[PDB]
């Protein structure tokens, strides 16, 4: 019985004053306390004050911080259902990925509802029928990746140049980009429906390596300098090191695998199954996998905190759940009306973006 | 521990120190014994003593309980991130049950606790006459433990004001007992329920308990973003009915008394 | 342990039992808590309590120590072959140091004890004004720990009468310390030194200690068959000067008051 109620979100003071001035003109021509949300200062911070804590922390342990609540500030409008989002905290440029079109937005301007993007990019103009499923961003913000189903290749855009243009088509004619991946190395990774993975060098645009497996096994892919992780409908789990070029571990499950995650400060591997079980595995000792959290709804996306303390989940059941690493228990809850497909996180740890229905929403983190 | 023992021995002769704080520093058993010996000495006049994240042994709990059995001029005590067993909890609550206790505030946030000691906790709450503030944190009381606690509370002999529960793994079943206790608790003033799964119907029941004229719950700590439209409308109705009720996520920000003198 | 809780709960309304004995029965922690709770109320009127082989561990000692600290009309307590810690012994000494304690005799025969608790025992002996009989058995007090005890014994402020050190790992070196303590200790009346090795020279010092006119000791637990012929002549000389002295190997045979009523 959710019975959800929707209200204007920001209620910014400038908007309130503008609304007040608009009414007076209409009244003149007709003859013929209040709570406002703090704006995003310069598109970087909110400038709020932190919350109190029951006790002081240890002198050595100052950097470890955990969040409490999430507050939404802006809503981004796209007429079609969105599939992926990108943050790009350095340039304050948010990218929204949908089935048909891609748009780019800037967070400098203050507005309740954003309808006009700074740049609009569509891949359906080039070909007769273009269906897009995947997208990816680079840490250096010098490249933008977008893969499609019937699109013959993958298109790279560069944000360093004064103008946006297509770098290379990098064709995969018979293979649809179910999975798209990238690394710190210049090297490109991608997975497709027919259990095939083909690998190209951006500098020279040549195929260097091909991998083959059973069908539906390329639904997921995890990249590391010495670890390549692969799993799909089969539920076989394979870890590969390019150096000695052989599968390291094989693992079996009762159901399919969709979600994987990695932790930067110390390796941990998170598993999401069709029956809704979260399994955690450490990549140092390499002994055993363990499960601590179970969800009735299928889990589609996952992400980890830059600090290495909390992970938030997005699933079929229109819910957002955030946990912690020591026990796996959830610490706060925020539900949404639509089925949440995507998720995102910021390297700075101040913002967060999630999208379920055609439009996208931007939230703010409190510490 | 040697430095702590020397410091306590030096402070033994002192008599003008009322507020003392010692945190994050390892303290030995002999240090706790010497501190209790100093406390037993008259003219101590030490009101507030704060100790957190300093390992305390089981025997030291015995010394603390013996001091608490006949204690004056010692109002506030804190213990956080300290290993306290359920048997130690029973010993502590028995020591508190004695009428010669003036401890207004007790804080036990991260002490590992289970559901068994909750019955003794309810008994001591019912018997105690001077405890005002009680706080609990990440310790998992359990559904049965909260049920027993609320059964002890609904009788409402205790005059405690502030109760804190956070990440105690609550469910929707205990909400009925909580609402029943609140409905006959004119003394209760502040309450916190954060990081605990509460269903929709539990939220309606709690809102109805808030709306009852008997309840005087003023400070409540909850996150409004987690709940649906109907719960938000009900909370707005609660604010309409009582003009002095405020709901804010940051429950620890409110300070009725100086608790963060050391934190500043 | 479930059965034992029933008896004390039933006895809670009793006003008759002055002597209660239990032994060789497994007892839980909760039984001790209720038993301690049993004596908490007035009109308990229970003098002697014996629990030899009952397993008492951890907080149960703290439960007793809290009760004993502020207690009266409970004179005789005995624990034997039940494990206690040195720290638990330290907790008991602090309670016994309080003026509000009338416990006459205390027995710990096979309880494990070491040298560390001896210093706290030495301080307790001097200040205590209500303890008469102290019994220590198989516990290894050691040579150094015993020497610490004689310093409190030498100061002679204590009024204890009967002391027992059987199989306390005495040696030849500590013989000098005991002789000084016996030299100036008019209050001491009965002593036990059995299953302990003494130097022939040290016993020559010990025998001279007995002949001292200042000593007023009447009961000695020693086996005359153990020692040297010259010592035997010195031992016979002790009886010649003082006709009232008695030297017998069987020290537990003598009963100033009823102690083996349960064994009877």
From Swiss-Prot, chain A:
Q: Please describe what happens when the gene is knocked out.
A: Females show normal ovarian histology, ovulation and egg morphology, however fail to produce offspring following successful mating. Progression from one- to two-cell embryos is delayed by 4-6 hours and embryos failed to develop into morulae and blastocysts. Embryos form unequal sized blastomeres due to smaller, dysmorphic, and displaced mitotic spindles resulting to asymmetric division.
UniProt effect for mutating residue 336 to K: Impaired formation of the subcortical maternal complex (SCMC)
Organism lineage: Eukaryota, Metazoa, Chordata, Craniata, Vertebrata
Swiss-Prot/TrEMBL keywords: Cytoplasm, Nucleus, Phosphoprotein, Repeat, Transcription, Transcription regulation, WD repeat
Expression induction or repression:
Induced by E2A-HLF, a chimeric transcription factor containing the transactivation domain of E2A linked to the DNA-binding and dimerization domain of HLF. Induced during TNFSF11/RANKL-induced osteoclast differentiation.
Free-text function comment from the UniProt entry: Component of the subcortical maternal complex (SCMC), a multiprotein complex that plays a key role in early embryonic development. The SCMC complex is a structural constituent of cytoplasmic lattices, which consist in fibrous structures found in the cytoplasm of oocytes and preimplantation embryos. They are required to store maternal proteins critical for embryonic development, such as proteins that control epigenetic reprogramming of the preimplantation embryo, and prevent their degradation or activation.
Its GO CC terms are: cell cortex; cytoplasmic lattice; cytosol; nucleus; protein-containing complex; sperm midpiece; subcortical maternal complex
**Tissue specificity as recorded in UniProt:** Expressed in spermatogonia (at protein level). Expressed predominantly in ovaries, where it is restricted to growing oocytes, with greatest levels in fully grown oocytes. Expressed predominantly in testis, heart, lung, liver and muscle, and at very low levels in the brain, spleen and kidney. Expressed in bone marrow-derived macrophages and osteoclasts.
Relative to the complete UniProt sequence, the shown stretch is: 146 to 581 of 581
Which coarse location class applies to the principal site listed for this UniProt protein? Answer: cytoplasm
Cellular localisation: Cytoplasm; Nucleus
Where Phosphoserine occurs, residue numbers? 305
What stretches of residues are WD repeats? 33-69, 77-115, 127-167, 170-210, 213-250, 252-291, 294-333, 335-366
| Comment, domains | Contrary to other WD repeat Groucho/TLE family members, does not contain any identifiable Q, GP, CcN or SP domains. Only the C-terminal WD-repeat domain is conserved.
Q: What is this protein called?
A: Transducin-like enhancer protein 6
From Swiss-Prot, chains B, C:
Q: In the UniProt annotation, what is the result of changing residue 11 to P?
A: Decreased interaction with TLE6
The observed outcome of changing residue 130 to Q is:
In strain: 129/Sv and CBA/J
Q: What is the effect of changing residue 178 to P?
A: Decreased interaction with TLE6
When the coding gene is removed by deletion, what phenotypic consequences does the entry describe? Mice appear phenotypically normal with no apparent defects in ovarian development, oocyte maturation or ovulation. Cortical granules are scattered throughout the cytoplasm in oocytes and ovulated eggs. Reduced abundance of intact MYH9/MyoIIA and MYO5A, the dense cortical actin scaffold remained present prior to exocytosis. Increase in polyspermy in the perivitelline space resulting from a decrease in efficacy of the zona pellucida block. Increase in multiple pronuclei and delay in cortical granule exocytosis and ZP2 cleavage.
Source organism, top-level taxon: Eukaryota
Q: Where does this protein reside within or beyond the cell?
A: Cytoplasm; Cytoplasmic vesicle, Secretory vesicle, Cortical granule; Mitochondrion; Nucleus, Nucleolus
| LRR repeat coordinates | 16-36, 45-65, 73-94, 102-123, 130-151, 159-180, 187-208
Q: What does the record note about the induction of this protein?
A: (Microbial infection) Reduced by T.gondii in the testes and uterus.
What does altering residue 171 to I do?
A: Decreased interaction with TLE6
Q: What does the PTM comment of the record read? A: Phosphorylated by PRKCE.
Its assembly, as annotated, is: Component of the subcortical maternal complex (SCMC), at least composed of NLRP5, KHDC3, OOEP, and TLE6. Within the complex, interacts with OOEP, KHDC3 and TLE6. The SCMC may facilitate translocation of its components between the nuclear and cytoplasmic compartments. As part of the SCMC interacts with the SCMC-associated protein ZBED3. As part of the SCMC interacts with the SCMC-associated protein CFL1/Cofilin-1. Interacts with PRKCE. Interacts with TUBB3 at cytoskeleton microtubules.
What does this chain do?
Component of the subcortical maternal complex (SCMC), a multiprotein complex that plays a key role in early embryonic development. The SCMC complex is a structural constituent of cytoplasmic lattices, which consist in fibrous structures found in the cytoplasm of oocytes and preimplantation embryos. They are required to store maternal proteins critical for embryonic development, such as proteins that control epigenetic reprogramming of the preimplantation embryo, and prevent their degradation or activation.
Q: Give the similarity note.
A: Belongs to the NLRP family.
Q: What is this protein called?
A: NACHT, LRR and PYD domains-containing protein 5
């Amino acid at each position: 019985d959710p019975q959800p109620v929707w209200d204007a979100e920001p209620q910014f003071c400038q908007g309130f004053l503008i609304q007040g001035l608009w009414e007076l003109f209409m009244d003149s021509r007709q003859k013929n306390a209040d709570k406002f949300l703090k704006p995003l200062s310069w598109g970087s911070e909110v400038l709020e004050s932190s919350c109190n804590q029951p006790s002081t922390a240890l002198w050595q342990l100052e950097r470890f911080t955990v969040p409490q609540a999430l507050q939404k500030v802006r809503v981004l409008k796209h007429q079609e259902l969105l599939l992926v989002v990108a943050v790009s905290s350095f340039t304050r440029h948010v990218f929204t990925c949908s089935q048909s079109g891609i748009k780019v937005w800037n967070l400098v301007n203050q507005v309740a509802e954003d309808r006009d993007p700074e740049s609009h990019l569509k891949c359906s103009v080039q070909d007769n029928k273009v269906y897009l499923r995947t997208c990816l961003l680079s840490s250096n913000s010098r490249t933008l990746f977008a893969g499609g189903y019937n699109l013959p290749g993958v298109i790279v855009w560069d944000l360093a140049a004064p103008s946006l243009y297509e770098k290379c088509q990098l064709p995969c004619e018979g293979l649809s980009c179910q999975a798209l991946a990238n690394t710190k190395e210049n090297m490109a990774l991608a997975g497709f429906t027919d259990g095939t993975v083909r690998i190209w060098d951006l500098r020279t645009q040549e195929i260097v390596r091909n991998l083959k497996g059973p069908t539906n096994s390329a639904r997921n892919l995890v990249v590391k300098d010495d670890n390549i992780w692969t799993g799909g409908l089969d539920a076989c789990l394979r870890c590969w090191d390019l150096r000695m070029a052989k599968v390291s571990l094989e693992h079996l499950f009762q159901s399919q695998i969709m979600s994987l995650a990695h932790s930067p400060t110390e390796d941990w591997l998170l598993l999401g199954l069709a029956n809704g079980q979260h399994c955690l595995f450490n990549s140092r000792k390499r002994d055993q996998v363990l499960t601590v959290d179970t969800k009735d709804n299928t889990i589609l996306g996952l992400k980890f905190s830059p600090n290495g303390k909390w992970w938030a989940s997005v699933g079929m059941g229109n819910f957002i759940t955030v946990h912690s690493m020591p026990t796996g228990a959830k610490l706060f809850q925020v539900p949404e009306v639509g089925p949440v497909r995507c998720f995102d996180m910021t390297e700075n740890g101040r913002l967060i973006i999630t999208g379920s229905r055609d439009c996208a929403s931007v939230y703010h983190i409190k510490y | 521990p040697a430095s702590c023992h020397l410091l306590v021995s030096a402070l033994f002769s002192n008599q003008n120190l009322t507020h003392l704080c010692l945190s994050n520093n390892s303290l030995g058993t002999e240090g706790v014994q010497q501190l209790c010996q100093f406390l037993r000495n008259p003219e101590c006049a030490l009101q507030r003593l704060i100790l957190n994240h300093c390992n305390i042994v089981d025997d030291a709990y015995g010394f603390l309980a013996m001091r608490l059995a006949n204690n004056t001029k010692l109002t506030h005590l804190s213990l956080t991130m300290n290993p306290v067993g359920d048997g130690a909890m029973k010993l502590l609550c028995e020591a508190l049950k004695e009428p010669t206790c003036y401890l207004q505030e007790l804080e036990l946030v991260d002490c590992q606790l289970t559901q068994n000691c909750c019955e003794d906790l309810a008994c001591m709450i019912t018997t105690t006459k001077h405890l005002k503030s009680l706080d609990l944190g990440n310790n998992a009381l359990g559904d049965k433990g909260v049920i027993t606690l609320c059964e002890g509370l609904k009788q409402s002999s205790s005059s405690l004001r502030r109760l804190g529960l956070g990440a105690c793994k609550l469910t929707s079943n205990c909400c009925e007992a909580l609402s029943l206790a609140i409905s006959c608790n004119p003394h209760l003033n502040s309450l916190n329920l954060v990081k605990n799964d509460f269903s929709t119907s539990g939220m309606l029941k709690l809102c109805s308990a808030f709306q009852c004229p008997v309840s005087n719950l003023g400070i409540i700590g909850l996150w409004k973003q987690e709940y649906y439209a109907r719960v938000r409308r009900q909370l707005e109705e609660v604010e309409f009915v009582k003009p002095h009720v405020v709901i804010d996520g940051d429950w620890y920000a409110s300070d009725e008394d100086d608790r963060n003198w050391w934190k500043n």
